[PDB]
Amino acid sequence: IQRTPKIQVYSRHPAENGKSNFLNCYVSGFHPSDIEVDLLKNGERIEKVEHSDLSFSKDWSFYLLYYTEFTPTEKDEYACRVNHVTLSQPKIVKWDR
Amino acid sequence: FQGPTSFHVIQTSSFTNSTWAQTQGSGWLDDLQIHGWDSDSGTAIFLKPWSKGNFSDKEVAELEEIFRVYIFGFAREVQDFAGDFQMKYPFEIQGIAGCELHSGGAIVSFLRGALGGLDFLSVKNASCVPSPEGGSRAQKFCALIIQYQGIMETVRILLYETCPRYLLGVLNAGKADLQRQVKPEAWLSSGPSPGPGRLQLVCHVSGFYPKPVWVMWMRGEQEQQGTQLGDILPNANWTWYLRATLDVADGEAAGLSCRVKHSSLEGQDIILYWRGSGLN
Ligand SMILES: *[C@@H]1O[C@H](CO[C@@H]2O[C@@H](C)[C@@H](O)[C@@H](O)[C@@H]2O)[C@@H](O[C@@H]2O[C@H](CO)[C@@H](O[C@@H]3O[C@H](CO[C@H]4O[C@H](CO)[C@@H](O)[C@H](O)[C@@H]4O)[C@@H](O)[C@H](O[C@H]4O[C@H](CO)[C@@H](O)[C@H](O)[C@@H]4O)[C@@H]3O)[C@H](O)[C@H]2NC(C)=O)[C@H](O[C@@H]2O[C@@H](C)[C@@H](O)[C@@H](O)[C@@H]2O)[C@H]1NC(C)=O
Ligand SMILES: CCCCCCCCCCCCCCCCCCC[C@@H](O)[C@@H](CCCCCCCCCCCCCC)C(=O)OC[C@@H]1O[C@@H](O)[C@H](O)[C@@H](O)[C@@H]1O
Ligand SMILES: *[C@@H]1O[C@H](CO)[C@@H](O)[C@H](O)[C@H]1NC(C)=O
Ligand SMILES: [Cl-]
Ligand SMILES: [Cl-]
Ligand code: NA
Numbered sequence: 154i155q156r157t158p159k160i161q162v163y164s165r166h167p168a169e170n171g172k173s174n175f176l177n178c179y180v181s182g183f184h185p186s187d188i189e190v191d192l193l194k195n196g197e198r199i200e201k202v203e204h205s206d207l208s209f210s211k212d213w214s215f216y217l218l219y220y221t222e223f224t225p226t227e228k229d230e231y232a233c234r235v236n237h238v239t240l241s242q243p244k245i246v247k248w249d250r
Numbered sequence: 251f252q253g254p255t256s257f258h259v260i261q262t263s264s265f266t267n268s269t270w271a272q273t274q275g276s277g278w279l280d281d282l283q284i285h286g287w288d289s290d291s292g293t294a295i296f297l298k299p300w301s302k303g304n305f306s307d308k309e310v311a312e313l314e315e316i317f318r319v320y321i322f323g324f325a326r327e328v329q330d331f332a333g334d335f336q337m338k339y340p341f342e343i344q345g346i347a348g349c350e351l352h353s354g355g356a357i358v359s360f361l362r363g364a365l366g367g368l369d370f371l372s373v374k375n376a377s378c379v380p381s382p383e384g385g386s387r388a389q390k391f392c393a394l395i396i397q398y399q400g401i402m403e404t405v406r407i408l409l410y411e412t413c414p415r416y417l418l419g420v421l422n423a424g425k426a427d428l429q430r431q432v433k434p435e436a437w438l439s440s441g442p443s444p445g446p447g448r449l450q451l452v453c454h455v456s457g458f459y460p461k462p463v464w465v466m467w468m469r470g471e472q473e474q475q476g477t478q479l480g481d482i483l484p485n486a487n488w489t490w491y492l493r494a495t496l497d498v499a500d501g502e503a504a505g506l507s508c509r510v511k512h513s514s515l516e517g518q519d520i521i522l523y524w525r526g527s528g529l530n
Contacts, residue, residue, distance in 0.1 A: 154366060165456060165485050167437040177491075179483050184367040185342045186262055186274075203486065206276045206286055207262055213344055213367040215262075220486045250439075 156214055157239040158183035160246040162232070168225045168250035176223045176248060178233035181216035189236040190219045193245070195229060225250065252460045252513060253428035254280035257417045258348025258360075259317075263325065265332065267339045271325040275317070277301075279420065279428065281461075282488055292318040298427065304419030313412075316404070331394070335387060341366055347373075349413040357417060359409040376406040431514035432489055434458035436465075438508060438522050438530060447500040451524055453508030456491040464511040467496040474506070 159182045165175035180190055186207060192199045205218040223231060231248040256279065263273040277285030277294070286295035293314050296302060302310050328343065347361040361373035369381040370388050378395055380388030396402055421428065436455045443450035455465050461482065467474040480493040494508065503524055510520040524530065 156367065161483060163483065163491060165491075166435065167454070175486060177483070177485060185340070186264060205484075206283055207274050208260060208276065208278070208281075208283075209262070209344060209346075213364045213369075218484050218486065 154184075155239050156182055156184040158188065158235055158237050158244075160233055160235055160244065162246050162248045164223075164225070164248070164250065165220075170226050171224065173222060173224050176221055176231055178219045178235075178246070179216070180219070180233075180235055181210070182214040183216075183237055183239070184214055185238065186215045187238065188215075188217070189243075190217065191234045192219055192221050193230075193232045193234055194223070196232075198234075199223075251421075251425075251429060252462075253430075254282060254421070255352075256280055256348060256350035257284075257413065257420060258346050259285075261321075261343075261345040263321075263328070263343045263345075265325075265328065265339060265341050265343070268329055268333065271329065273321045273325065275321070279424070281484070282428075284420070284424075287317070292321075298424060300420070300423035300427075302420075303416055303423045305416065316408075331391060335390070337387075343370075347409065347413075349409070349417050351417060351421070357414040359413055361405065361409060373405060373409065376402065376410070378402070427488070430459060432457060432459035433514040434463065434510060434512055434520070436508065436510050436520045436522055438524055440503075440524075440530075443497050449498050449500055449503055451496045451498060451503060451506060451508075453494045453496075453510075453522065454491070455494070455510050455520075457485065457489045458512050458514065459489045460513060461490055462513065463490070463492060464509075465492060465494040466509055467494065468507050468509050469505050 158180045161179040163177050165177060176192060178190060178192055180188065192202045199221050202219055202221045207215060207217060209215045233246045234243050236243045259275065259277050261273060261275050263271055265271045275287030276283055284297050284301045286297060288295050344364045349357050349359040351357050363371045368383045370384040371381055371392060372379050378392035380392045434455045434457050436453060439452045439454065441450050453465055453467065455463065467477045474496055476496055478495045483491045485491050504526040506524040508522045
């Protein structure tokens with residue numbers, strides 16, 4: 154009955170340290186629709202994150218895109234944190250260039 | 251013509267308990283959002299200057315009034331049905347309705363509804379058709395709905411008369427954005443793959459519009475059949491991202507290239523070459 158989200162973290166452009174880019178977190182295949190998504194920089198919630206309005210696929214699974222401008226560096230860690238009824242606790246998926 | 255060929259409206263109505271339900275709605279051209287539904291105002295948000303297509307302000311307001319009345323009436327009807335039947339809270343209902351322009355010019359309309367993420371009903375040639383997944387509950391719902399005067403008639407007009415003229419008007423109004431050409435960029439990456447002496451090569455392709463694209467791993471002119479296409483992922487601002495992977499034996503990656511063909515490239519395919527020994 155309930156469907157756990159798939160979480161995909163990717164950058165808009167190939168990563169280059171010091172060059173501005175966009176970090177995307179695509180959350181999909183989940184049911185029901187209620188979900189909490191945050192983009193993190195070094196384990197802290199980024200405030201300037203935008204997101205799509207709710208939509209769903211042909212099989213009725215919901216999906217959302219969360220994104221923010223980011224300037225990757227050698228040290229900084231970025232991630233997507235998701236909470237949903239199907240998850241025991243928030244699931245963190247790290248961005249890996 | 252290129253770009254989207256369909257318009258649809260979607261509904262997600264979330265029922266928390268017998269007295270509390272909330273609806274989210276939006277309008278789309280294929281995967282591109284053009285309308286939002288503002289629950290604070292009971293009106294539509296027009297996301298593009300051309301989102302009203304060739305419709306007058308009066309027709310747009312009459313349609314918003316129909317959706318406003320529907321969203322209110324629907325929640326009340328479901329809460330009544332849920333009580334009469336074996337429905338446990340919380341539950342979610344989804345709906346999708348719209349039309350699409352096919353090759354040859356025919357416009358086909360559709361309406362589908364779901365309960366609990368499973369098919370529940372559809373509208374096939376102006377009547378309510380229960381889906382087998384919906385079982386007896388869908389049969390009773392369709393029989394109840396057709397008893398309410400004017401409903402099926404309003405559905406028929408919206409689907410078969412209003413939607414087709416709307417779609418044509420909006421595909422023309424939005425053509426400069428819908429039929430625009432945006433060039434992708436591409437890059438390579440690699441990593442270990444399951445099993446001894448296996449490598450996975452990845453060809454990333456990002457920023458292309460419209461959606462149709464061709465990406466393949468190659469050895470000279472030989473297309474590698476083993477190329478696996480990932481699902482096309484969205485970027486913000488109406489562009490797409492795709493990963494095309496190839497599993498190869500270690501020591502057999504040299505000689506591989508990734509070729510990208512896209513409508514925006516004017517016949518200049520992107521060709522990336524994988525190099526061994528960390529020479530990427
Ligand atoms: C928004 O745009 C819609 C689409 O417009 C067309 O496409 C866009 C992209 C632009 O290129 C436009 O310039 C272009 O018009 C409008 O809807 C369309 O309106 C036209 C013009 O009224 C209409 O054509 C009429 O069609 C009927 C036949 O229709 C039936 O049969 C066809 C198959 O053959 C079928 O596809 C239809 O669904 C119907 O079953 C025909 O009898 C008419 O002929 C009469 O008029 C012409 C002059 O126009 C004359 O030469 C003839 O001799 C005769 O008197 C005429 O050809 C299209 O059918 C219609 N398209 C659709 C899919 O509905 C839309 O117009 C408004 O709605 C219409 C239904 C009609 O009531 C119009 O009066 C309205 O303005 C427009 N605006 C809005 C608000 O929707
Ligand atoms: C610019 C963007 C625009 C895009 C344009 C494209 C067109 C979109 C095409 C997609 C089609 C969208 C379909 C949405 C559904 C609209 C339904 C309208 C109903 C109202 O109608 C209806 C509202 C009351 C709701 C009653 C609860 C039942 C709800 C279950 C309906 C299931 C759906 C049917 C499937 C079997 C009504 O009974 O309302 C009162 C009516 O209006 C009065 O004026 C009239 O006098 C009365 O007799 C009627 O009863
Ligand atoms: C239903 O849920 C709402 C919102 O969570 C709450 O305010 C309300 O009092 C609940 N009512 C019932 C039927 O118990
Ligand atoms: Cl497209
Ligand atoms: Cl080589
Ligand atoms: Na978990």
